[PDB]
Amino acid sequence: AGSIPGRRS
Amino acid sequence: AGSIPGRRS
Amino acid sequence: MGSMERASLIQKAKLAEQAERYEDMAAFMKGAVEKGEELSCEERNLLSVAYKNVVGGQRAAWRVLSSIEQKSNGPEVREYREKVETELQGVCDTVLGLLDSHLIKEAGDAESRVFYLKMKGDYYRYLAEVATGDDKKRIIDSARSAYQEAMDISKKEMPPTNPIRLGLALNFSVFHYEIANSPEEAISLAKTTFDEAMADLHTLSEDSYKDSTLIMQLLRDNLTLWT
Amino acid sequence: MGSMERASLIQKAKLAEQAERYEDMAAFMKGAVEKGEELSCEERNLLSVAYKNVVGGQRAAWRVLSSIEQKSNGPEVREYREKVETELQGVCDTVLGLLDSHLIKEAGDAESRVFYLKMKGDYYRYLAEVATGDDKKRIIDSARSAYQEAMDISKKEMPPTNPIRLGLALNFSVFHYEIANSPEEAISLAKTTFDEAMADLHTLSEDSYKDSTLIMQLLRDNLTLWT
Ligand SMILES: O=Cc1ccc([N+](=O)[O-])c(N2CCC[C@H](O)C2)c1
Ligand SMILES: O=Cc1ccc([N+](=O)[O-])c(N2CCC[C@H](O)C2)c1
């Protein structure tokens, strides 16, 4: 399913 | 202000 | 893209749009233009979507960096804004070069000629957004001249509800308001365009009515913000 | 990026993040890593954000194209999916190469070592998503081995609420569910991780509590979808 989004510092 | 979006065919 | 078939470039541009890979889409459509044949209506739309997305991302980034740079008024913010600016200018020059070699000169029908001249005005407008001083003046006049030729053709050859005619008028009004310091001209153009389209809606099918009224709403939205 | 100062590369990476220019951000952070110094906590986050956004866009595009290709089962969809796949593999290999030369070997503190080994597991996982057959097997074991070493360190050296420990467990559980065909292991790991963090929340400040509970919610979200 969902991993760490990690798109925003 | 807003021009033609034109981002989607 | 010289080794790829024209039809394969077009097919890959459509796939790139679905995948939201707009830089790829623009490269495929540049390759298709460089095959030297005229573009169909659908193909013209693919070319416009590809480059509008590429330059749209660049313009958004340039605005973020320009706002940070103005707030700061080391060299890093200016240097990076300059890098983005040069990349944006390169994409605009690429599009303008495709239009000049040789899309416009081969475009004889009103729909294609107006479409390409509107694009020429748009890409000079994007250059004008980042230009300073005297080079701003000649760039602004190049945008104005392209939009004006497109307007002249569209008024002679298309009904007032034609979506390309409407979008041309919308974008030329934005040029007047945002670039040319002519807000009154922008407001007049948007108002006259809207009113003349409204009086022609009765001629349209349900599908064409939807297409035209969608752009009319954008004219109305700008008029609400400007007045 | 060899001619640019380390501090300028870091500054430009932060500007690129604000401008949503993630390919630029990744290039700046690669240049910073290649200066040869260890990365601070903030700098590690910049490296991860940059590449996660780049590879995230590639993975989304690959999924769109793979779905079209499977539906079709000319060469264009396969050829374009292959192009995107090769680009994605190149970015993963670049990240893995930075970790191997020489971020992991110089990382002695638990926070840095666990962070880099989690990244190593993630990028092998992204390679595994597109791999087929036997090369899938060795890629899968490389992901598993990196995650396992990170888990072993995190359990010895960090509290159960530490956000990197929590995110490692979350991503390793996704590996088990999506890559390794081990949904029961995924569910067990997410449940045990959540329960052990919940029992440690009482030790935390308000700010740390917010950080930990945000990741705990992601564990709960996956458990709800998996059960
Ligand atoms: O920063 C991370 C990032 C950025 C963009 C995207 N994307 O979908 O474009 C993603 N996805 C792609 C794969 C599926 C995953 O669940 C998340 C992650
Ligand atoms: O397809 C067109 C497109 C794509 C993305 C963006 N963007 O903001 O990223 C934009 N903007 C940028 C400039 C301001 C304009 O009003 C629209 C247009």
C163-174 and C183-198 helices cross at what angle (nearest 10)? Answer: 160
Chain breaks of chain D after residues with C–N above 2.5 Å: 73
In angstroms, what is the resolution?
1.4
In a domain, D139, yes or no: yes
Say how many CB pairs under 8 Å bridge C and D. 54
In a domain, C72, yes or no: yes
**Which class for C41: exposed (0-12), middle (13-18), buried (19 or more C-beta within 10 A)?**
exposed
Torsion of CA D120, D122, D125, D127, to 10 degrees: -70
The amino acid occupying position C8 is: S
In a domain, C41, yes or no: yes
In a domain, D129, yes or no: yes
Solved using: X-ray
D6-18 and D22-33 helices cross at what angle (nearest 10)? Answer: 160
Angstrom distance (rounded) from CA C43 to CA C30: 11
**Closest to C19 in 3D by CA, of C58, C48, C50, C60:** C50
For chains A and C, tell me whether 3 or more CB atom pairs sit within 8 A of each other: no
Domain count, chain C: 1
Write b or e for each residue in C46-82: b if 16 or more Cβ atoms lie within 10 A of its Cβ, otherwise e: bbbbbbbbbbbbbbebbebbbebbeeeeeebbebbbe
Angstrom distance (rounded) from CA D10 to CA D37: 13
Q: How big, in percent rounded to 5, are the helix, strand and coil portions of chain A?
A: 0, 0, 100
In a domain, C1, yes or no: no
User: Which residues on chain D are in Cβ contact (under 8 Å) with A6?
Assistant: 48-49, 52, 167
Contacts of D77 by beta carbon, 8 Å cutoff, 6+ apart: C15, D65, D68, D69
In a domain, D1, yes or no: no
Quick one: DSSP state of residue C200? T
In a domain, D165, yes or no: yes
Tell me the longest C-alpha to C-alpha distance in chain D: 61
D41-72 and D110-130 helices cross at what angle (nearest 10)? Answer: 10
The amino acid occupying position D133 is: G
**Closest to D171 in 3D by CA, of A3, C141, C56:** A3
- CATH at D133: 1.20.190.20
CA distance C122 to chain D (A): 23
Angstrom distance (rounded) from CA D132 to CA D179: 12
Helix, coil or strand: residue C67: helix
Domain containing C102 equals: 6-227
Kindly report the protein residue whose alpha carbon is nearest to atom 8 of ligand 2: C60
H or E segment and range at residue D11? helix D6-18
In a domain, D35, yes or no: yes
Kindly report the protein residue whose alpha carbon is nearest to atom 6 of ligand 1: D56
